[PDB]
Design a protein around this ligand. Structure first.
Ligand SMILES: O=C(O)c1ccc2c(c1)s/c(=N\C(=O)c1cc(Br)c(Br)[nH]1)n2Cc1ccccc1
Length: 195
C-alpha cells in the first residue's frame, strides 16, 4: 500500500505527457487547473446552487474551492488513512486529482465537512502528516491549492489568466446552474461566470 502509492505517483512523473499533456508548451500546466476544476464541477453538479472559486495566487500557485459536500475524511480501511488522502495519492481512486498532486512541488488540501475544518499538505504527492482537524465550521466544501513542479513543467511555467477564463466561461455555459469565480491575486483581475 505504502509502496504502490509512492509508485503510482512515480509512474505519473515518469510519463507526465501521458497523464496531463505537453509539459513544455503550457498545455499540461493549464490542464493541471482544469483537472481540479472538473472535480469541483462534478461536485457542484451533485448539489444545488453551488459555487466554484479559482484563484491564481501571487506565487503562481492555483486554488480551486467548491462549497460542496467536502471530500470524506473517515479512514479508508484498505489503506488505513483518510479517504481524502487516498483520493489525493492513489492513481486508480478523467485521470484524477492524484495526477495533479504527483506533478505538484506542494499541494494543500482543506476540507470543511460535518462541523470540522481538515487540512493536509503534500510535497511531490507525499503527505507531510495525516489529515488533521484545524477547527470548527458550519460551512462545507473542498479547497485544493497546488504549486506545479518545475521538475516536470518547462518553458511555459506561469499561469495565463485568459486560458483559465476561456475554459471557465465554457464550463459556466455548459453547467448553467454553477457559479464560477476567477480571481488573479497577481493584479486583482476578477471575473464571475454564471449563465
Ligand atoms: O459525501 C459523500 O458521500 C461524498 C463522496 C464523494 C465526494 C464528496 C462527497 S465531495 C468529493 N469531491 C469533491 O468535492 C472534490 C474533489 C476535488 Br479535487 C474538489 Br476541489 N472537490 N467527492 C468525490 C470523491 C471523493 C472521494 C472518493 C471518491 C470520490
Amino acid at each position: 500500500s505504502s509502496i504502490k502509492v509512492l509508485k503510482g505517483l512515480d509512474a505519473v512523473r515518469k510519463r507526465p505527457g501521458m497523464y496531463i499533456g505537453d509539459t513544455d508548451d503550457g498545455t499540461g500546466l493549464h490542464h493541471m487547473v482544469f483537472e481540479v476544476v472538473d472535480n469541483a464541477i462534478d461536485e457542484a453538479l451533485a448539489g444545488h446552487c453551488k459555487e466554484i472559486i479559482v484563484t491564481i495566487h501571487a506565487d503562481n500557485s492555483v486554488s480551486v474551492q467548491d462549497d460542496g459536500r467536502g471530500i470524506p475524511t473517515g479512514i479508508h480501511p484498505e489503506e488505513g488513512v483518510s479517504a481524502a488522502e487516498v483520493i489525493m495519492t492513489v492513481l486508480h481512486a478523467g485521470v484524477g486529482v492524484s495526477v495533479v498532486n504527483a506533478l505538484s512541488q506542494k499541494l494543500e488540501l482543506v476540507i470543511q465537512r460535518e462541523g470540522k475544518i481538515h487540512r493536509q499538505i503534500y510535497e511531490h504527492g507525499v503527505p507531510q502528516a495525516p489529515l488533521a482537524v484545524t477547527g470548527e465550521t458550519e460551512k462545507t466544501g473542498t479547497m485544493v491549492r497546488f504549486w506545479p513542479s518545475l521538475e516536470t513543467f518547462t518553458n511555459v511555467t506561469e499561469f495565463e489568466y485568459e486560458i483559465l477564463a476561456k475554459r471557465l466561461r465554457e464550463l459556466s455555459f455548459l453547467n448553467s446552474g454553477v457559479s464560477i469565480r476567477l480571481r488573479d491575486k497577481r493584479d486583482g483581475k476578477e471575473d464571475h461566470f454564471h449563465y
